[PDB]
Amino acid sequence: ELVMTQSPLTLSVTIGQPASISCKSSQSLLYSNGKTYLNWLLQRPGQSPKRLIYLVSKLDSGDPDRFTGSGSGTDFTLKISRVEAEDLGIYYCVQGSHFPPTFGAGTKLELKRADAAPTVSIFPPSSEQLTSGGASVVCFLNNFYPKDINVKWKIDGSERQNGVLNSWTDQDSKDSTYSMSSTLTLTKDEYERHNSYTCEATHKTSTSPIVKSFNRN
């Protein structure tokens, strides 16, 4: 099939500053006639996708000349001379020369800021939950930046991943940092067969794994 590799997955822009997104195709979109079918859409949070450019560089109705599409064959780029608040969102790449038409994963615009280590808190299962037979350990890694983080649950010794569920908040509009919740869920007997529970995060702010664990004692 045809594959669209967009990048970066998340672009960190600065209001007023310019921005550039890349989209490559696993094959040429240069069709038999003269048209190379490649458009970009912009989905602002909570909205429906809105096509911005069509046929590599043609702007749509009411499109600030701030956006500029360009490219040829397999390589294409979307640029914004000066990012404005309203531009923030996910930008999508889509091809129509090959069938079926395909999209790229989308590039998310995010406001850059200063690196911030995350705060970490681990929470042992609620007795109230135990009584019901289950047991979930929760870990919160709050107000960190950059968004890129790596979390692993370490029980007693090794890493484990059965019943682990994570969730991410959107970029906070007040401080521009991210937060992540991570929940390890076990049966009560599963939980009771171990002593140590650790929430281990690897973020760029620390050359050392950030840990916060607890033993059942």
Binding site: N39, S121, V138, F140, L165, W168, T169
Partner: protein, 217 residues
């Protein structure tokens, strides 16, 4: 002008079926193709297929060959799609669109949730500090709002008093049921001395319960 109005959020019991509609208006319905896209939770965009309302000629993405059936009703210029025997894998926001020379226009989309689940109030569990004595000055507590359905749920701390330093993570639909968590941070001098409680509501169950975050033994 131009518009594509889609049907309201539909709940679909797994292994059955559904039919969504997209009402065209403000142009010659039977003049252009009608596209249908999908967007699973958190994912990008999938082009399902397209149908021309002039002669009902359809062209489908082979991946949905046996899941999607596209039809049109000239009289009321509505375009339909029918999901045949949908799994949880089909839960997503479905869109209809016209993306051609004469313009690119998208519907507002229809949320589809596939789940045998029935209305279910959530199990609210208190996230109390395990034993990380002080940690510093600030302390974070939490509330695990587990196992409800459908969405959403409202979570507030101390009836609204506590607003800053709060993180209510996006709900994650896992195994027929929605689970979500929320954290809160306060100065070690206010808790446990005072009383922190999350007050979470679940409109679908006409429920709203409070969970006092008690200092762990």
């Amino acid at each position: 002008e131009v518009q594509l109005q889609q049907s309201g959020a539909e709940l679909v019991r797994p292994g059955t079926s559904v039919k969504l509609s997209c009402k065209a208006s403000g142009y010659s319905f039977t003049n252009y193709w009608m596209n249908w896209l999908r967007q699973r939770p958190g994912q990008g965009l999938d082009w399902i297929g397209m149908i021309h309302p002039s002669d009902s000629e359809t062209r489908l993405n082979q991946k949905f060959k046996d899941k999607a059936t596209l039809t049109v009703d000239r009289s009321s210029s509505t375009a339909y799609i029918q999901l045949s025997s949908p799994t949880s894998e089909d839960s997503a926001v479905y869109y209809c669109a016209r993306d051609d020379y004469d313009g690119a226009f998208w519907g507002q989309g229809t949320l589809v949730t596939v789940s045998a689940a029935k209305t279910t109030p959530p199990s609210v569990y208190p996230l109390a500090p395990g034993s990380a004595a002080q940690t510093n000055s600030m302390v974070t507590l939490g509330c695990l709002v587990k196992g409800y359905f459908p969405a959403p749920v409202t979570v507030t701390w101390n009836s609204g008093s506590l607003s800053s330093g709060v993180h209510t993570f996006p709900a994650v639909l896992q195994s027929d049921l929605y689970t979500l968590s929320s954290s809160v941070t306060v100065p070690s001098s206010t808790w446990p001395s005072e009383t922190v409680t999350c007050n979470v509501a679940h409109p679908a169950s006409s429920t709203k319960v409070d969970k006092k975050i008690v200092p762990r033994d």
